[PDB]
Structures are given as C-alpha cells and as structure tokens.
C-alpha cells in the first residue's frame, strides 16, 4: 500500500553478490560485449541490432519494441529471421552467440544485485525538488550505465565505480526536471554557487550581503547587476491555486486580470475605429483611398516600401507615392471637419 516500502521489499529479494559472484558477472558482461562485436563482422550486421536481438530473447518476448537507432523495425518477424541466421553459423562461430546471451543474462543480475546501492545514495539527495522514487529511478539509470562501462580487470569493487555514475545521474535529474521553467544544467550550477557564496558571506558578516559583496566574492567577471539578473532568472513561479492567506475562500489566481482578450469597450473601440476608418476613405473617392488602403491594409498590413508597387494599383510606380500624400492631406482637411478621430489618440 506504500510505494517506497514495496520497492524496498522487492530489492530485498535479490541477495547481494560476493566478490567472486560480482567479478563473475562483471566478467561475463564484458566478454559478452566482445562476443557481439565479433559477431558483427562474421555476420555483416550491426552490433547494436545484434545487441538488441540477443537482448530480446534473454528477457522474454514480454519486451519487444523498436529501439531508437536500429535500422529495422524490431518485431517478432525480424528477430526470428535474425536469430536463425545467428544459429545458422558453424559451431566455432555460434559459440559466440551463447556468449552474448549469457552476457546479457549476467548484466541483468548485476544490475538487480546493486539496486540497494542506488537507494542509499538517493536517500541523501532528498528535498531538492525530486521525489525519493524519482531519485531512485534516475539513480538506477546511472547504475545501468555503470554496468555497461565497468572494466572488471582494474579489480575495483563494483560499488566504487557505480557510485560515480549514480550520483552523476541523480544530480542531472535534479538540475533538469526540478524547475517548472527548465533552465540549462550549467546555469543552475552557477545559481547554486551564488547561494553557497552568499550563505558563507552572511555567515561571516552577521547579516545579509548586498549584490556587490556577492559580486566580488564571486571573483572576476561578476558585478552587482549580474548577481541581480542571475537571481531574477532563478525565480520560481508561484501557484495560481495558492490560498490568499485566509485559506477558506481565496485563490491568488482570482486576483489576476486577463489582459489578453479585449474588454467589451476595447472590442467596441476597435470595431468603432474601422467603421469610421473606411467611412472616411470613401468620402474623398474610394479609388485614391483604395490606393492608400492598398498601401497600409485594413486587414492584412500590406506595408513594404518601393518595389511591389510596381505592379497592380492602376498606375506605374512613383505616382502611388504621390497620390499617397494627396489622399493623406485631402484626408487631413477632410478630418479638420470630421474631427471625430482626435479622441482615438488616447
């Protein structure tokens, strides 16, 4: 009924390896990858595709899907065809198929056997915006790639190498998902630094530093305006559903006007404008008002400058610019009488 407790129970199902079982599994994983490389050349196939076909049958047909990067759609048709060529090889060649498949069988058990390691690393990274289980899965993802690059012959215990990749994958995960406005991983690294810097500053100054005292504590390149624009970037959004104190019947979002949609006055004002905008072009003549109306555009905005006007207005090219003015100034006398457009100046 509790999701943490159940996963802690399920990883307690795999016993942890002994030094020989650990090196055995590590051993077979690496030898299995060397298997698949040589099987690429015998076969004329692609290591990744052979890797997934070996992969398919160890796990069972429970999991069969298209894997990103492989050239063929990976469905039971092609894995049967590709498997039976694999099995169509001489006994000295097909001994390497058997090596691959126990490769991936060991890799699975090597992963499952180190799941408790991820938990005890992840438990230290709580309270940074990712949930425990979200941490674990990201930690497990590092464990998976620590298995694929572990070189067992350096004789380090596996715990030692895996811890590096786990912590690497957790801290990426934090820096990439924790913010509603996702920001680049290195930029969060800088923000986190400002805070550590300030905290020690405050810790010696006995009061909160100003941006200038941070700026110099940051070294060259840092002034106070850059401390200031770094923090405005670091700012996290707040919830529309926040209760406005009282907690009874008040949401922050209820206090926020919608400034996108026009109000009834605005939509009426914009209608009113086009209404007397064209009832003013047609009152000199609509033709020279059509030339000018073609210049700016009631609905379209048809505004370039010199060239296209070479085509269809009715005349050639510099004349439209001239009747531009005469429509404009006939408009301007036309408006000294119909001075009802002054008000639109706001």
């Amino acid at each position: 009924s509790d999701p943490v407790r159940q996963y802690l129970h399920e990883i307690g199902q795999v016993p942890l390896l002994t030094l020989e079982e650990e090196v055995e599994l590590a051993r077979k994983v690496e030898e299995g990858m060397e298997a698949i490389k040589k099987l690429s050349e015998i076969t004329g196939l692609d290591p990744d595709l052979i890797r997934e076909v070996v992969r398919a049958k160890i796990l069972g047909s429970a999991r069969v899907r298209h894997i990103p990067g492989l050239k063929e759609t990976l469905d039971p048709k092609t894995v049967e065809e590709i498997d039976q060529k694999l099995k169509s090889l001489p006994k000295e060649h097909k001994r390497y198929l058997h090596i691959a498949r126990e490769g991936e069988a060991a890799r699975q058990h090597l992963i499952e056997a180190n799941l408790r390691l991820v938990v005890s690393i992840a438990k230290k990274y709580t309270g940074r915006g990712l949930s425990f289980l979200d941490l674990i899965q990201e930690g497990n993802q590092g464990l998976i790639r620590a298995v694929e690059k572990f070189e067992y012959k350096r004789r380090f215990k596996f715990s030692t190498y895996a811890t590096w990749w786990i912590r690497q994958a957790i801290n990426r995960a934090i820096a990439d998902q924790a913010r509603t406005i996702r920001i680049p991983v290195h930029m969060v690294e800088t923000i986190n630094k400002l805070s550590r810097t300030a905290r020690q500053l405050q810790q010696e100054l006995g009061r909160e530093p100003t941006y200038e005292e941070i700026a110099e504590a940051m070294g060259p390149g840092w002034d106070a305006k850059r401390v200031e624009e770094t923090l405005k970037i670091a700012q996290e959004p707040v919830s529309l559903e926040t209760p406005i104190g009282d907690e009874k019947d008040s949401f922050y979002g209820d206090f926020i006007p919608d400034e996108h949609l026009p109000s009834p006055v605005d939509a009426a004002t914009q209608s009113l404008l086009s209404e007397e905008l064209e009832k003013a072009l047609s009152k000199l003549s609509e033709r020279e008002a059509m030339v000018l109306k073609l210049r700016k555009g009631l609905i379209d905005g048809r505004e370039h400058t010199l060239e296209e006007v070479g085509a269809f207005f009715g005349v050639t090219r510099e004349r439209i610019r001239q009747i531009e003015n005469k429509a404009l100034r006939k408009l301007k006398y036309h408006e000294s009488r119909t001075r009802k457009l002054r008000d639109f100046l706001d």
């Binding site: 996963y7 399920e10 429970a62 899907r65 991936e104 899965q137 497990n140 993802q141």
Partner: peptide
C-alpha cells in the same frame, strides 16, 4: 520509454510502470 529501449531489469521497469 528509455528504460525500455535500454532493456532494464523488470524490477526497474516494474517500479517506473507503477509510478
């Protein structure tokens, strides 16, 4: 989606599927 493509053990795939 990525844990599937990378053939993770089913205890791992199980955990995410439930999450």
């Amino acid at each position: 989606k990525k844990l599937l493509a990378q053939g993770a053990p089913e205890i791992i795939i199980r955990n995410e599927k439930r999450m």
